[PDB]
Amino acid sequence: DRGVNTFSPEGRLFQVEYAIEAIKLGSTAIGIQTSEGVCLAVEKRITSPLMEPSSIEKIVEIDAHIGCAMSGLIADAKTLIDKARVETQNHWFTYNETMTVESVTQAVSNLALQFGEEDADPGAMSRPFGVALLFGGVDEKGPQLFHMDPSGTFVQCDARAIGSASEGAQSSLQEVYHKSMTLKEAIKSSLIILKQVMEEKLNATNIELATVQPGQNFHMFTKEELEEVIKDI
């Protein structure tokens, strides 16, 4: 055809604006930064009921205080999640402290728009990473979540939706969040997943939710905590 390092008669790269697609494909994830934590959730879209639903990893903890939430072309993120955690323990190794979220997000997003056909040794990448994700993390600045693109563009976010529900869920999330956690942002975010519902009334088998709170490190929620929340709606 044409190659990967070419600009499009719209104005942007071909492979980047094609990498914005295959994010509409794939599951939906949402995150809300609050004043005392950040909650992440994803409806991981189980296909068959003959099976085991608690091994579709879409909430992945980078460190104890950074958890990411990917979507889109799944399992393409594992190289840059690997770079996220290896860079994390390299930072803690060489500097003996915690990190920010813009340093892991700074480090991963450098690998996004870093590919090409004829370059150095063939351990490089050909296509861009077609996985949009967001690092929910707590810092000494504050809890915050950084929405990445496949373009390497990362932004500060406090209420961001990815996946196929990037328009209706984002517009619903635009009008329902201003204040703080006080335990009910995690219950007013699965409510957005409740409006999103594709196959099943959002029980504790098809959604994975995890919060990062400044007191603890993280908390990947188990089943009885989830269905404790779902019973309240």
Partner: peptide, 8 residues
Amino acid sequence: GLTADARL
């Protein structure tokens, strides 16, 4: 312009 390329 591009942001990742700008940061590079």
